[PDB]
């Protein structure tokens, strides 16, 4: 098991103290490109950002 667990580095609780600890810690613990700013920017007809910003935004998933 490669999950990252909680670890009590120091001391031992009794089972009741462990139950309190864990209950407390547990109790504490779609694209919509419409009007994206990149559409609002004004580009030169030859601006490379039409590739590297605009398409790289609209196409990106």
């Amino acid at each position: 098991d490669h999950e990252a667990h909680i670890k009590v580095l120091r001391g031992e609780p009794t089972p009741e103290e462990m139950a309190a600890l864990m209950a407390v810690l547990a109790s504490a613990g779609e694209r919509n490109m419409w009007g994206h700013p990149v559409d609002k920017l004004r580009y030169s007809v030859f601006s490379w950002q039409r590739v590297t910003l605009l398409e790289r935004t609209h196409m990106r998933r």
């Binding site: 098991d1 667990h5 909680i6 670890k7 009590v8 462990m18 139950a19 864990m22």
Partner: peptide, 22 residues
């Protein structure tokens, strides 16, 4: 459900089955 959370305490594995959703 139950959330069986493994804890290590000084190296002892100790599953605590908490109530699931909370």
């Amino acid at each position: 459900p139950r959330q069986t959370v493994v804890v290590e305490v000084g190296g002892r594995r100790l599953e605590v089955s908490l109530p699931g959703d909370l």
